């Protein structure tokens, strides 16, 4: 019912720009596609514009627009992401990889013209040059996870923590522990939600005709966890 929410009735182009620096290896990624929040579907194609990506694509999936989550009718009043639009929100993460380094991210998610832009700065420190991440030992896939969202009244926003399990190619498992905080860019009021969760499925593919290091991504996201 919020004007912010109603910006998402149709199909919204998405641009994603990431500049990263992991153990001093600088890279950029540009993604383009579209989002359909009514059905909770995203389609995006990402390209590493600086050459070979120095980390694995799956480690960047959470970083690379939860405003495209499908929120059931009975949970309309709890969609922070959309309510912050058009001015958008700041999204900050720490991602701790077990027995390895740490990503720190800050991103601004907002409309620029009639396009939803996710602009990200990523800093990675303490990685092992022959570990799972800098040595590219992760499988090219991504499992479904549930992200539990809670209000952060004091920051007039929300937070979450959740673990991602990345399959390693020898059959072992690489944990990435996420902490997340979001906060409006605007001043204008925003919905502060009751506890609930988002449910995500991610499908990663390749375009045989694209020589640049890239990731084709299809994503489904819905919200749940409120029964009234």
């Amino acid at each position: 019912v919020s004007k912010g929410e109603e910006l998402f009735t149709g199909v919204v182009p998405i641009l994603v720009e990431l500049d990263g620096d992991v153990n001093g290896h600088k890279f950029s990624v540009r993604g383009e596609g579209e989002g359909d929040a009514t059905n909770g579907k995203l389609t995006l194609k990402f390209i590493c514009t600086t050459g070979k990506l120095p980390v694995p694509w799956p480690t960047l999936v959470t970083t690379l627009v939860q405003c495209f989550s499908r929120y059931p009718d009975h949970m309309k009043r709890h969609d922070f992401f959309k309510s912050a639009m058009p001015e958008g929100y700041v999204q900050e993460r720490t991602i701790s990889f077990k027995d390895d380094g740490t990503y720190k991210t800050r991103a601004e998610v907002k409309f620029e013209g009639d396009t939803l832009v996710n602009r990200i700065e990523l800093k990675g420190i303490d990685f092992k040059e022959d570990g799972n991440i800098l040595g590219h030992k992760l499988e090219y896939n991504f499992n479904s996870h549930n992200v539990y969202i809670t209000a952060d009244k004091q920051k007039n926003g929300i937070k979450a923590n959740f673990k991602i399990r990345h399959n390693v190619e020898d059959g072992s498992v690489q944990l990435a522990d996420h902490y997340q905080q979001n906060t409006p860019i605007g001043d204008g009021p925003v919905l502060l939600p009751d506890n609930h969760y988002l449910s995500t499925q991610s499908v990663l593919s390749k375009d045989p005709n694209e020589k640049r290091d890239h990731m084709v991504l299809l994503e489904f996201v819905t919200a749940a966890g409120i029964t009234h």
Side-chain angles (χ1 to χ4, degrees), residues 2 4-154 156-174 176-210 212-228:
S2 76
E5 173 219 58
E6 288 290 271
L7 291 171
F8 292 87
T9 59
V11 178
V12 180
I14 296 171
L15 169 71
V16 183
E17 314 180 289
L18 179 148
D19 290 313
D21 181 14
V22 177
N23 278 32
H25 303 111
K26 302 206 207 306
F27 61 101
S28 307
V29 171
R30 177 183 188 94
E32 286 170 25
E34 71 184 20
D36 171 6
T38 303
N39 288 312
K41 272 179 269 192
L42 295 171
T43 40
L44 289 154
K45 183 163 177 174
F46 299 95
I47 293 153
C48 181
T49 56
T50 44
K52 191 175 200 344
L53 198 67
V55 300
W57 279 108
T59 67
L60 295 187
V61 165
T62 53
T63 302
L64 292 165
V65 288
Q66 287 158 147
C67 49
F68 288 101
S69 318
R70 179 182 194 276
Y71 276 75
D73 286 334
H74 60 91
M75 282 175 65
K76 289 315 195 206
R77 299 163 191 282
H78 300 97
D79 190 351
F80 168 89
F81 302 100
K82 284 187 194 68
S83 78
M85 296 294 164
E87 277 190 75
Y89 55 85
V90 183
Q91 173 160 302
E92 301 197 328
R93 291 216 184 89
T94 301
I95 303 176
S96 317
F97 297 83
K98 181 94 164 103
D99 304 322
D100 213 326
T102 298
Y103 297 163
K104 304 169 197 202
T105 66
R106 184 183 187 283
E108 299 204 344
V109 188
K110 52 172 191 291
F111 275 83
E112 292 167 34
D114 293 296
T115 292
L116 191 289
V117 183
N118 181 15
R119 274 225 183 65
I120 308 145
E121 289 277 355
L122 176 151
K123 173 75 154 172
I125 58 153
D126 267 279
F127 289 84
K128 327 219 255 219
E129 298 281 345
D130 291 331
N132 286 154
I133 289 98
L134 285 184
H136 298 262
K137 300 185 188 181
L138 297 188
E139 290 185 344
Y140 188 62
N141 56 27
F142 202 88
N143 301 333
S144 297
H145 199 40
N146 281 160
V147 173
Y148 289 87
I149 285 171
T150 172
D152 191 348
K153 58 251 141 291
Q154 90 215 95
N156 213 96
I158 60 181
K159 63 175 188 290
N161 61 283
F162 56 95
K163 301 163 182 294
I164 298 291
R165 283 98 183 172
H166 295 115
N167 287 347
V168 189
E169 283 182 326
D170 70 354
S172 64
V173 171
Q174 173 67 250
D177 193 358
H178 286 57
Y179 174 91
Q180 180 182 327
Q181 48 185 30
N182 298 70
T183 212
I185 288 180
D187 290 348
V190 290
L191 296 173
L192 249 41
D194 289 355
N195 299 342
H196 67 274
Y197 61 92
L198 298 187
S199 201
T200 305
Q201 182 191 275
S202 296
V203 183
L204 316 192
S205 57
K206 296 297 196 173
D207 170 12
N209 292 316
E210 178 62 74
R212 292 170 296 185
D213 197 0
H214 72 278
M215 172 179 71
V216 180
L217 182 59
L218 160 74
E219 208 155 281
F220 303 107
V221 191
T222 53
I226 289 165
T227 324
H228 207 28

